[PDB]
Amino acid sequence: PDMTGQLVDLPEYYSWGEELTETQHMIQRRIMESVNGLKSLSAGRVVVVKNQEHHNALGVILQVSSNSTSRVFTTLVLCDKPLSQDPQDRGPATAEVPYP
């Protein structure tokens, strides 16, 4: 490619985008790794859920299982009401870049 001009910072931006996520994941660990997170995680807690299903959809945890080893969260998460019933319409799309 040719990056002279409007694209000069194209590689460096990428690094800035990636490291934050790595840091965020580490920061995310420094959230669950703490004894205080293990105390806060209970009923009456709202969390932002990030997976393939929910993309930063707001959800509220109803309860945390007493067995704190396999912490499975029964959680109410908002998603679009499904106007379909067939998995065949789902297909791979453009990889969502982390934008500013």
């Binding site: 409007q6 694209l7 910072d9 194209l10 800035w16 985008g17 920061i27 500013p100």
Partner: protein, 100 residues
């Protein structure tokens, strides 16, 4: 980590690539090249010598040998080394007793 994240977020919210015509293609191609280059780097390390668990202990042993007079710089055996070579047991102590 949080302060570096804050600075990266501040810089990212001013990026010039976000306004470029060719932001997705070049950027994804850079993603691909860096990922492949990184996997190559790890692969080369797996075939190298630093992977060896005991390499630092070998280095420390060579230093202990060279501090006594048994090995020249850059590892060539001296006369004391060849004496402790052809000895049954307690090579270091026995050759030290002999020289003393």
């Amino acid at each position: 980590g949080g302060l570096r994240a804050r600075k990266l977020e501040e810089l990212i919210q001013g990026a010039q690539c976000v306004h470029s015509p060719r932001f997705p293609a070049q950027y994804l191609k850079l993603r691909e090249r860096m990922q492949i280059q990184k996997e190559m780097e790890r692969l080369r390390f797996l075939l190298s010598d630093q992977s060896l668990l005991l390499l630092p202990e070998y280095h420390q042993r060579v230093e202990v040998l060279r501090t006594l007079g048994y090995v020249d710089e850059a590892g060539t055996v001296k006369l004391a080394g060849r004496v402790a070579c052809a000895m049954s047991s307690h090579e270091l102590l026995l050759t030290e007793l002999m020289f003393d």
